[PDB]
Amino acid sequence: NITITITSTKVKAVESLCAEVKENGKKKGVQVKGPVRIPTKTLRITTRKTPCGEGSKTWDHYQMRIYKRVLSMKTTPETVKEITSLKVEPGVELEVAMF
Amino acid sequence: PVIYAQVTEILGRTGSRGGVLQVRCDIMGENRQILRNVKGPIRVGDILTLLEAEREARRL
Amino acid sequence: MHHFSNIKDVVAIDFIKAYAEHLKKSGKLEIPEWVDTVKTGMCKELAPLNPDWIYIRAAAIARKVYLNNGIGVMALRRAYGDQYNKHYNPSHRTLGSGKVNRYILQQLEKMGIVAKIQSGRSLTKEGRKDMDKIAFQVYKEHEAKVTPMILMPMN
């Protein structure tokens, strides 16, 4: 039993990678478990806009978003994802965790 | 002791604060129209309760 | 309709009163010497007014072990906790006094009611037997006293 999890700041990126692994899993792989979508993490920071204390007290809202997807394979420990890189796009991390 | 005046239609409002409407009302017992100032809210179908009918409230 | 399967089918405060006096007649619960000299937690300002406050608390703690599989002492401390409003600051939640909860939990182990789960405490087969036996008695009196809302007369 093998488990794959991909995390990135871009939602459109992981959907492409999730599809690619599923498409790639026809050969050198038996089945392609659907991408389990772990709830999104949001990293909020609220900060004052002014370098000083003058003026109206106006704040600005920033937020990072983390998208987490979980894939499970069967395959073989030796074969795994083989290349497992596919010149992976920047900011999108893939890690493979078997048992 | 009182008489009722069903609202016919609403002219508009009164002194610039606009808390009082001018409503034209007719009395069912004598089919006679009258113009009265009312403290809102009001709607077209409402029927008032008047203790006096000789006051033609016009605000000049 | 109504049917009895466990203690969730009877009123909790009515069951706790029933389980309180049964422990009293049984007499297997030992009274600590500091019973009158303590309050149930930091937040409170007066000691419990009920003379048998130990026995009522023991029934409530027994019920919590019935419903929840494994409960630590701290989970009981927060369950029996009040709001700390002793000053001008707005009140915030606080824990109960862990000693009285740990002591009564330890006492319930002596009478063979609770057990030692590797991550808390549980009930025993005989402890479950007594708990539901009293609960069924509460169910019968409840039904014979009030009428169900489902069978409440149409009005």
């Binding site: - | 009182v2 009722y4 002194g15 808390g19 009082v20 009265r36 100032n37 009312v38 403290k39 809102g40 809210p41 009001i42 709607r43 179908g45 409402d46 029927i47 008032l48 309760t49 008047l50 203790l51 006096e52 006051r55 409230a57 | 409440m152 009005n155």
Partner: protein, 185 residues
């Protein structure tokens, strides 16, 4: 087959209204939605003009019984207080408590007010709002720092304002405003 909801399993809605000027603005028995077991509904009666007239009248009395700082949002408190007071009202006058409240609203609502001063009429919806405003205000003041309970102070307020009694706070206020407006023609 014939659902006839009541009040808290004790009071019915077969009320009649003397004042025809308030017949259409009072939610009592004209529609099935107005007959409710509880005066607790989460309906949105303040999203359009003249929508609060669709709220049950007993509920409106509860919502005004929720005033001042430390009573905000305690509808369960005001529900219990009104429910207890309705039993007392039935005991005192031996009528339908809903029927008495209908008579209280009619008799404790001014029919004439003054405004810059000039005497102006009071619209039917204002009369209902002011009736529940004056009755609740008097009960709150009477029960403050008093041994009597709110249900006791609400019950005698309604029954006094019901027929004509001038001991009620609402009747005192109503006769005060109309006398001022009468001199302000």
């Amino acid at each position: 087959h014939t659902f006839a909801p009541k009040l808290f399993n004790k009071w019915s809605y077969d009320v009649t209204v003397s004042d025809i000027s308030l017949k259409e603005l009072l939610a009592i028995n004209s529609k099935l939605k107005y007959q409710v077991f509880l005066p607790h509904t989460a309906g949105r009666y303040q999203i359009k003009p003249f929508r609060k007239i669709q709220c049950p009248i007993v509920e409106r009395l509860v919502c005004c019984m929720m005033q001042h700082g430390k009573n905000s949002g305690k509808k369960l408190l005001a529900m219990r207080v009104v429910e207890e007071s309705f039993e007392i009202i039935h005991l005192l006058t031996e009528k339908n408590p809903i029927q008495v409240l209908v008579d209280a609203i009619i008799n404790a609502s001014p029919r004439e007010d003054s405004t810059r001063r000039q005497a102006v009429d009071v619209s039917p919806l204002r009369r209902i709002n002011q009736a529940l405003y004056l009755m609740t205000m008097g009960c709150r003041s009477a029960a403050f720092r008093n041994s009597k309970t709110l249900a006791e102070c609400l019950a005698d307020e309604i029954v006094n304002a019901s027929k004509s009694n001038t001991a009620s706070f609402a009747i005192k206020k109503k006769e005060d405003m109309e006398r001022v407006a009468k001199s302000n023609r």
